[PDB]
């Protein structure tokens, strides 16, 4: 299939900025490229078709360009209702979408406050152990969380959840939950959460030893 | 062709030959 | 105005069948090709199927071939998606979408109108109340409640019966490997308040009649 | 060579039905999509309908959808337009036209051959013969000057009337004006001719007005005043 | 719907002139644009298709250009049989025609000869009264007629008709008919037709007294 990619994943912008987001195709799609807008909980909305044709009813500050394997969506002066996620889609060979680019609201860099929570004694009685790492009140969105259990890097063993910018929050918070069986949790001693984020001069590691 | 025109097209060719 | 009203989504077990509907108005439905597109929770858009304006030609994505069938009844202005042999990977919001009529173009399609979407949840889980575990705090301290292993959505969380709102972050639920949902709700408070202010998370899961107030104490 | 001969037009009241025909020859009718196009009096061209060569696909203008039906009989090499629920606004000359074959084109159509047209008149008015009145010239002397005379053809329906002068012997200086449709639904026109004033004393001038739908045939002598 | 406009509405040219007329589409129609010629009482005739392809049998002096929204039809050297109305037509989305451009025969300015006709005694016996004003053999086509009844301007009671351009002298004629009831006609004395035209340095008024 034709694989569509987009950059960046999250773009920090302020009202009035000229914003560009890029879309790539794994092979030439000529000019058969569309751009969509989507907001949380809402349906996608067609912005651009045939790489550069503005869909009727769409504001003129939106424009598209490109051909072959490189495409660009341009917003000439970003407006408040433009904070959203944007998808490109090819229709040269079947129909495939890019991963999407989110445009969020720019503010000053904020390093996350990192907290780690051992499993509660109540849960250990139930037979499972959840270790929770909290990255609180940070910006921009990009953040790397690495789990280490007795210096062993965990891969595919945790799940993340994020609270978004809203009417009361200018920053993100993120939870990473590492779920283990009680038997496995008792087999190991050092549980560490390592956080990388552009507000920190070095990665911050928060850890505990099982049993205080 | 899955990318062929799936809409009604009054401007399609109405003759027997191209 | 053009409208696409969807219905038929719901919770089903793997291997069951489900039929989606998309009732159109505000345009000439029988002259437009139509698409189904789905969006997994937290993920992007994925094309599913297309059907010609007269129902002649049909094309499917490889992941749904042999299992899904697209059809239409132009007399009722309704589009259908028959979903058989459903897998957990089919869990998604499903959209119907009208094919854009760009007269000059020789390739298709862009999608110029989308339905509001209908949620299809394929799960082997059954209704189950959550367990509520404390996230104990150790100057700013963080504390919270882990609301683990419930089904289906949603649960609500408040703190101190609504008296604590500032600094509260209630994370969206994540679907675990077992098919059960889990979320946490956290809050940051002054460390000096841990010895005088009680912190209780109020959790409600109406589908299971599970209503719990869990006090979170330092450890 | 290529021929498109139309028939079936006429004068009817709103709500009545009419069926137009277009008989083709000189080409392979069955290989061509065909169109109907109309032209209201004094107006431009308006597309009406198209039909595929095999009669499968048909498309209509919004103004006729649900009232007009296009069809064809390839064995008879004939194109049809069934016009039901006619409205006064459907009054026009209707043309059948052949879709141009352009192999390199991915859009259609231009119309490369047109029929002669058939006239469709839709009106609540009823057939009425005209009143023919003299437009008398002045017998005042103008030396070697010019006088004007004519006939007023007043309040008739439907079109057309034919006007001649001196049984067709008089043609120089004649102007027969296009009819004007009045608010009552009736038409009137005038036909005039300029003649030397020196001819008024001797040469008899007579307008001949024929309105076949009303069995009207009038010869009106136009005497100077 | 895609709207087609044409400019100019009317054009006066001479044999041998280079004539270029324009056609515009409200949206892009690519090159799916055809040009037609039509003469009074005749069916349209295809001249150009696909914006610039000359239809077989059409003289080489006809050409077309454009793609998108702006289109032109050019006649390199106008010929006597080229005086007609020209229409453009898009076939990108359904089928719509432009309003048409009429090419008339250029000639010198000629003032109208004005004649006024009282209602006949025959018509008066029937109960109505029509007054006719004739503007004969003038050029250009633009002319204005004003009816005056005892020096009072009239409205809503007259109708005008204009001939096609004459074959012999390339002029126009115009008739204006003022229609009153016999009773109303008997209520006034002076009936006048006032005419203005490019060829007249001052308005011309022809009048008569009832009776």
PDB file of C-alpha atoms in Angstrom, chain B residues 1-11, chain C residues 31-33 52-53 59 99-100 107-109:
ATOM      1  CA  UNK B   1     -10.242   0.518 -10.396  1.00  0.00           C
ATOM      2  CA  UNK B   2     -11.244   1.427  -6.824  1.00  0.00           C
ATOM      3  CA  UNK B   3     -10.219   5.043  -7.501  1.00  0.00           C
ATOM      4  CA  UNK B   4     -12.616   5.355 -10.434  1.00  0.00           C
ATOM      5  CA  UNK B   5     -15.445   7.883 -10.231  1.00  0.00           C
ATOM      6  CA  UNK B   6     -18.172   6.367  -7.994  1.00  0.00           C
ATOM      7  CA  UNK B   7     -20.665   9.216  -8.508  1.00  0.00           C
ATOM      8  CA  UNK B   8     -23.296   9.676 -11.178  1.00  0.00           C
ATOM      9  CA  UNK B   9     -21.555  11.509 -14.022  1.00  0.00           C
ATOM     10  CA  UNK B  10     -23.728  13.280 -16.617  1.00  0.00           C
ATOM     11  CA  UNK B  11     -20.476  14.344 -18.310  1.00  0.00           C
TER      12      UNK B  11
ATOM     13  CA  UNK C  31     -26.129   9.983  -7.319  1.00  0.00           C
ATOM     14  CA  UNK C  32     -23.228   9.780  -4.830  1.00  0.00           C
ATOM     15  CA  UNK C  33     -20.732   7.094  -3.992  1.00  0.00           C
ATOM     16  CA  UNK C  52     -20.903   3.151  -6.183  1.00  0.00           C
ATOM     17  CA  UNK C  53     -23.854   5.528  -6.478  1.00  0.00           C
ATOM     18  CA  UNK C  59     -14.296  -2.235  -2.795  1.00  0.00           C
ATOM     19  CA  UNK C  99     -17.537  11.040  -2.125  1.00  0.00           C
ATOM     20  CA  UNK C 100     -16.558  14.509  -3.333  1.00  0.00           C
ATOM     21  CA  UNK C 107      -9.033  10.056  -9.596  1.00  0.00           C
ATOM     22  CA  UNK C 108     -11.226   9.595  -6.539  1.00  0.00           C
ATOM     23  CA  UNK C 109     -11.993  10.275  -3.773  1.00  0.00           C
TER      24      UNK C 109
END
